[PDB]
Structure 1
Amino acid sequence: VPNNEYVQHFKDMYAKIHNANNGYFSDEGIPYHAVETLMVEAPDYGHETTSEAFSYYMWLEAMNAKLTGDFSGFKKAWDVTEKYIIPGETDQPSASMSNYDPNKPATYAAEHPDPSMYPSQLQFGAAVGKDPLYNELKSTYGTSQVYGMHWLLDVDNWYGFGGATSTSPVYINTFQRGVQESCWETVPQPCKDEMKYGGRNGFLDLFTGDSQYATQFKYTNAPDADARAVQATYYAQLAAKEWGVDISSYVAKSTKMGDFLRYSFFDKYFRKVGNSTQAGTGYDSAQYLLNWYYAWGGGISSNWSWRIGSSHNHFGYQNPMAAWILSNTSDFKPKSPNAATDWNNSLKRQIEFYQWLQSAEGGIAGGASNSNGGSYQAWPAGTRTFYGMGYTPHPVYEDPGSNEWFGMQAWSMQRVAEYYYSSKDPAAKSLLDKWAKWACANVQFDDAAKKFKIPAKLVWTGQPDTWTGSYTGNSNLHVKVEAYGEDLGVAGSLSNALSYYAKALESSTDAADKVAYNTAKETSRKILDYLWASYQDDKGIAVTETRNDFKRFNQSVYIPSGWTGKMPNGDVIQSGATFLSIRSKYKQDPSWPNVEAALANGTGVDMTYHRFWGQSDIAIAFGTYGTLFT
């Protein structure tokens, strides 16, 4: 096993993350989104957590097993995942799941350009296609229940949906009201709406319009997280083979999760791809990318259920490494007969998607949708397309734009790089060559200070050429870096990507590849060296960030006229609500006085955060460099 300073940096970070003093984990052994509680950005409280965090926990532990031969931590990560974030029997009652109708997967409702247009009316007469996965999955696993992670967990019952005296985890959701509903504009709701909290119909009639409402459950996948779980488990299995350890039952968990993850291939209402006013008859509604979500729900008081995909796709979610694992390794072939073939088709489609979205400069553009406006509107003449899906610079969300964050670049291209290293697929080479040149040109080193900045915010203009099968250079698609910053988690991910890219180039004898190898490897190493030299603190590796967006604690929340309800703690929900007015426990937070002062004299809020995923990306980047370059 490698024994160098980068391996040691991993072990030191690993020890920090697991030290009880540092507060990364709950009583249940669940990693929080961040150590710090006052935190709003996708989760809206720091001690919520995400399926993303669980997948990073798996990945962190896989790297530890690789370096130490100890797999106990990895097994633990999967055990807590299955117990707490994959809905169980009381969460998705089998009698409802078994009453699914794959010929009528769900009832159509439009998405809308503003939260004020919700609830959206259920349209029982509108077309919905056939679900071609259900019967195969049911036959394979002997149940109709779904084995996938729900995306958001209230780890210590901060919202109180679990009752006034519990700190056990509660499945919750936030985002419901379309493209303009930012994290500041949601109304948090329990995934199991038993109408005990909220209004007359619980929270249900904020979101969907119907003539009556019954108690029900709803879960929503984050496909990028479930794919990362597969990626992590493959790394653990490589380690298991090296160390002579059997983790086959954990491999089986990941492959089952990857089997259900095929729902992320499908249009929201199983509409034909590129002919989206029409109901699909099966795989003609397969987009074959990792979409923004699949979701499923059903009755509590009576037995019924539904499933949806998503028509929207973001490059930042894709994971060719996961797709390759599930389609081209024997260990991770899923049990459903068609799963490996489906994943092989997704692998090819994903790599095409990255190429299609690659800007003139090299950054990857947003994505594509099968549902213009989220209501299957006609595409404007001249719309640029990918297998019939229209280009979208900012998939799903525009407050802020979902492709403004540079982190998607690092996260997603890390997977392409690891995939290229593993498969040496020539279709990934020019894509990575071009992306890496752009990324490295935008890392700003201060060598005297041993510090750096990387892009924070990206601005997009133009559009790609319609995909005809090969990259065009996309001369009219552009990215500009609008701001630079010190997001250390993203920097860790970027190092990881550059490490795999360089290692993949190591066998090249081409002179230009050798130059690129040196540049990528040195850039990766310097990021790691400067992280270690200059950014360590007691809990991990971190730096202050200014959150000007925290002015939105007083953000108005849309509530329909005449609608009234209450949060579990009694906060009144009615027109005139704000982010803070329905989350009054924020004023009990130890960081609140600082926030309230800041709002008082019009400043951004300075915070130093230890995000679990960020600390994990940094640790894993150390371990990656230390293992690839011995």
Structure 2
Amino acid sequence: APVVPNNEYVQHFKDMYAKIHNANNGYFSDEGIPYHAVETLMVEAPDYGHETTSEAFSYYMWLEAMNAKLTGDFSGFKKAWDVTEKYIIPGETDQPSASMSNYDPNKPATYAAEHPDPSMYPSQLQFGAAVGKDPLYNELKSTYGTSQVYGMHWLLDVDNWYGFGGATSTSPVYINTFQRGVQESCWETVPQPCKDEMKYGGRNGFLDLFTGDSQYATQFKYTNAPDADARAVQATYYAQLAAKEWGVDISSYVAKSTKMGDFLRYSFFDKYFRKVGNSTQAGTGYDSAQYLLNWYYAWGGGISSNWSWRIGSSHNHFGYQNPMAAWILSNTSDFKPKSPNAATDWNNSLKRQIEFYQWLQSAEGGIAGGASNSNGGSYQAWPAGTRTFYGMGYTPHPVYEDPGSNEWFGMQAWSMQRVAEYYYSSKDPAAKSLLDKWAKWACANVQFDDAAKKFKIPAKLVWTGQPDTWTGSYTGNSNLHVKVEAYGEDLGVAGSLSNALSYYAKALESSTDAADKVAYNTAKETSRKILDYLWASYQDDKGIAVTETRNDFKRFNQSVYIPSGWTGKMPNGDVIQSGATFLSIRSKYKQDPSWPNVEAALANGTGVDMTYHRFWGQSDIAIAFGTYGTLFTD
């Protein structure tokens, strides 16, 4: 039997794990689905706290993988995959096989433009516009004996809060919110069911808010978040390493993750399979492969009749990349996917991803936003002097700008944690300078108060300038800059940051270079101090948390764009029409126990103070404890 480390960091993990699994704390639904957070009143990527995301499912796998590592008990990890497959990977009634089977890989979808403001939607279908070929479909169909897609949809209404599942049900409902481009903030969306049978909304359900066509038929649509599915692979690898040491068989769960990783190759592709670089032209297969983890792939089709479509995404954010997942799927025996080309494709993505991070690394060391094969999301010409990466144009804030998608320091920790774990696992020398420079910038920006045993980390980032066009090696990007504009006690992110610094330090442990030894000490001590202070100062009943201020809750009254003459209804009867607000189409928010507090604060012009326990945040903190406790058995 394996010898499990006995130190305080292992015990901190176990105490956090116990809090997360304590029924008193309410992290989980009746089905065993992790909510976005314990609390209900919050508007972030999901716009209600008891929605959840595919991110939460993969964090749940990761948490359980670490517990299995430390205890030899894999029942929790199996449970996490079981609920994932049951409730967030669309099944037969969600993506009817008859529609999926009528897919045409030579005509994957119909082009529509993205627009710089929600008021420019619905976007007209252009049946004459170029769309390239899907080179994955036939291989996947031959491999798995079906045309259905095995990937997670990104957003779930866990207890049917919107009521799209009917008035007397709390079964989970697949939903979408964001649809209307770069300037549609979380406050400006219209929630819709993924399965639009036109029971709710207007004449055509919600369909003609987003898509312009002469007729509308009932249909489904699911949208993947590639970083969540990649994390599922990352978690399952960690579980399998432990399983081999404990002597436990979880091969069928390994098989689930490699299948998910197989379909995740759709995240490599331009939205309409346009050639990368010469994006006005239809691709003929892999010439439309960007080979990064894009912002989404999506798929849909008919309910009342049999037809289907698929798209990738032309947009790529450094924050979504995962070299650890790509290395797992391409360079380990256990996780080679069943499609003949999958391992090779993933090996190519691994290479491209590591270059992408380097290309985006600022002069200070923070990683800049990303790049797109489609300027304005409508393949507009790039301005002269646009800096590029394999033909894709630099974008300081990929995909969304309210707020800027690279304003939040969280993306730095989340994504660079993966590079660090990858570097530890593979010792790929191409990752070293990247990590050296990033770690120096991150550690230089942690503010410790040693007397209070508290700290702050960067909260909000400001970007200027642009990288040198990628020619094969890092330049230092002396004209690309990041400034930290605000710091905060962002504890979930601090957990991720500690995780990253721990793997980075551990990877450096074998160096005999004097400068590496100094970097080792700095990274390891910074990581440890973060964990010690989290433990000493920020514990409460439900986990580890601190008050935060939301000054934008004034946007509960944010106007929502609805086309003139368009009318509809939410399931609870809320009227959807011009003049509607975020709140007026979500009137159940006023039934929330914390609502009086919110409107009180707004009424006398105060910020709103909240204490949140987000599932990913508590998980990141727990896993950070377990990570330090297992890498440094001191």
TM-score, length-scaled by structure 2: 0.99
- Write the distance in 1 (CA, Å) between the matches of 2:306 and 2:341: 29
Query: How far is the alpha carbon of 1:430 from its aligned partner?
Result: 0.2
Deviations 1:167-193 (A, max 9, x none): 000000000000000000000000000
- Equivalent position SS for 1:57: helix
What is the root-mean-square deviation of aligned Cα atoms in Å?
0.2
Query: How far is the alpha carbon of 1:550 from its aligned partner?
Result: 1.1
Query: How far is the alpha carbon of 1:134 from its aligned partner?
Result: 0.1
Query: How far is the alpha carbon of 1:155 from its aligned partner?
Result: 0.2
Deviations 1:70-103 (A, max 9, x none): 0000000000000000000000000000000000
Deviations 1:565-612 (A, max 9, x none): 000000000000100000000000000000011110111110000000
Query: How far is the alpha carbon of 1:132 from its aligned partner?
Result: 0.1
- Write the distance in 2 (CA, Å) between the matches of 1:434 and 1:265: 27
- Equivalent position SS for 1:596: helix
- Equivalent position SS for 1:239: helix
Query: How far is the alpha carbon of 1:37 from its aligned partner?
Result: 0.1
Find 2:186's aligned residue among 183, 187, 197: 183
- Equivalent position SS for 1:89: coil
Query: How far is the alpha carbon of 1:549 from its aligned partner?
Result: 1.3
- Write the distance in 2 (CA, Å) between the matches of 1:469 and 1:366: 19
- Equivalent position SS for 1:537: coil
Query: How far is the alpha carbon of 1:228 from its aligned partner?
Result: 0.3
- Equivalent position SS for 1:269: coil
Find 2:584's aligned residue among 574, 578, 581: 581
Query: How far is the alpha carbon of 1:330 from its aligned partner?
Result: 0.4
Query: How far is the alpha carbon of 1:435 from its aligned partner?
Result: 0.1
Query: How far is the alpha carbon of 1:129 from its aligned partner?
Result: 0.0
Deviations 1:1-42 (A, max 9, x none): 111000000000000000000000000000000000001010
Deviations 1:265-304 (A, max 9, x none): 0000000000000000000000000000000000000000
- Write the distance in 2 (CA, Å) between the matches of 1:602 and 1:249: 55
Query: How far is the alpha carbon of 1:373 from its aligned partner?
Result: 0.3
- Write the distance in 1 (CA, Å) between the matches of 2:56 and 2:429: 32
| Aligned match of 2:73 | 70
| Aligned match of 1:34 | 37
- Write the distance in 1 (CA, Å) between the matches of 2:78 and 2:608: 39
Deviations 1:375-414 (A, max 9, x none): 0000010000000000000000000100000000000000
- Equivalent position SS for 2:148: coil
- Write the distance in 2 (CA, Å) between the matches of 1:583 and 1:207: 19
- Write the distance in 2 (CA, Å) between the matches of 1:545 and 1:37: 15
Find 1:251's aligned residue among 241, 254, 260: 254
- Write the distance in 2 (CA, Å) between the matches of 1:277 and 1:604: 47
- Equivalent position SS for 1:217: strand
- Equivalent position SS for 1:101: coil
- Write the distance in 1 (CA, Å) between the matches of 2:553 and 2:273: 38
Deviations 1:55-77 (A, max 9, x none): 00000000000000000000000
- Write the distance in 2 (CA, Å) between the matches of 1:187 and 1:70: 43
- Write the distance in 2 (CA, Å) between the matches of 1:606 and 1:258: 40
Moved over 6 A (4+): none
- Write the distance in 2 (CA, Å) between the matches of 1:564 and 1:615: 41
Query: How far is the alpha carbon of 1:160 from its aligned partner?
Result: 0.1
Deviations 1:128-147 (A, max 9, x none): 00000000000000000000
Query: How far is the alpha carbon of 1:104 from its aligned partner?
Result: 0.2
| Aligned match of 1:314 | 317
Is 2:530 the counterpart of 1:522?
A: no
- Written as runs of structure 1 = structure 2, the 5 A alignment for 1:100-119 is 100-119=103-122
- Write the distance in 1 (CA, Å) between the matches of 2:554 and 2:625: 36
- Equivalent position SS for 1:62: helix
- Equivalent position SS for 2:130: coil
- Equivalent position SS for 1:313: strand
Find 1:22's aligned residue among 25, 28, 53: 25
Query: How far is the alpha carbon of 1:202 from its aligned partner?
Result: 0.1
Unpaired segments ≥5 residues, structure 2: none
- Equivalent position SS for 2:552: helix
Is 2:240 the counterpart of 1:237?
A: yes
- Write the distance in 2 (CA, Å) between the matches of 1:552 and 1:23: 28
Find 2:443's aligned residue among 440, 445, 448: 440
Query: How far is the alpha carbon of 1:537 from its aligned partner?
Result: 0.1
- Write the distance in 2 (CA, Å) between the matches of 1:605 and 1:259: 44
Deviations 1:205-229 (A, max 9, x none): 0000000000000000000000000
Deviations 1:471-497 (A, max 9, x none): 000000000000000110000000000
Is 2:132 the counterpart of 1:135?
A: no
Sequence identity percentage: 100
Query: How far is the alpha carbon of 1:165 from its aligned partner?
Result: 0.2
| Aligned match of 1:367 | 370
- Equivalent position SS for 2:215: coil
- Write the distance in 2 (CA, Å) between the matches of 1:443 and 1:526: 10
- Write the distance in 2 (CA, Å) between the matches of 1:515 and 1:604: 42
- Write the distance in 2 (CA, Å) between the matches of 1:274 and 1:444: 42
- Equivalent position SS for 1:228: helix
Unpaired segments ≥5 residues, structure 1: none
- Write the distance in 1 (CA, Å) between the matches of 2:35 and 2:278: 42
- Written as runs of structure 1 = structure 2, the 5 A alignment for 1:468-479 is 468-479=471-482
- Equivalent position SS for 2:505: helix
Deviations 1:299-336 (A, max 9, x none): 00000000000000000000000000000000000000
| Aligned match of 1:533 | 536
- Write the distance in 2 (CA, Å) between the matches of 1:380 and 1:563: 37
- Write the distance in 2 (CA, Å) between the matches of 1:98 and 1:330: 31
Deviations 1:436-490 (A, max 9, x none): 0000000000000000000000000000000000000000000000000011000
| Aligned match of 1:455 | 458
- Equivalent position SS for 1:331: coil
- Write the distance in 1 (CA, Å) between the matches of 2:51 and 2:341: 36
- Write the distance in 2 (CA, Å) between the matches of 1:298 and 1:98: 10
How many residue pairs were aligned?
Answer: 630
| Aligned match of 1:173 | 176
Query: How far is the alpha carbon of 1:551 from its aligned partner?
Result: 1.1
| Aligned match of 1:480 | 483
- Write the distance in 2 (CA, Å) between the matches of 1:615 and 1:77: 16
- Equivalent position SS for 2:419: helix
| Aligned match of 2:61 | 58
- Write the distance in 1 (CA, Å) between the matches of 2:156 and 2:534: 30
Deviations 1:331-350 (A, max 9, x none): 00000000000000000000
Deviations 1:207-258 (A, max 9, x none): 0000000000000000000000000000000000110000000000000000
Deviations 1:523-550 (A, max 9, x none): 0000000000000000000000000011
- Write the distance in 2 (CA, Å) between the matches of 1:64 and 1:163: 37
Query: How far is the alpha carbon of 1:115 from its aligned partner?
Result: 0.1
- Written as runs of structure 1 = structure 2, the 5 A alignment for 1:121-270 is 121-270=124-273
- Write the distance in 2 (CA, Å) between the matches of 1:333 and 1:220: 25
- Write the distance in 1 (CA, Å) between the matches of 2:522 and 2:459: 21
Query: How far is the alpha carbon of 1:434 from its aligned partner?
Result: 0.1
- Equivalent position SS for 2:484: strand
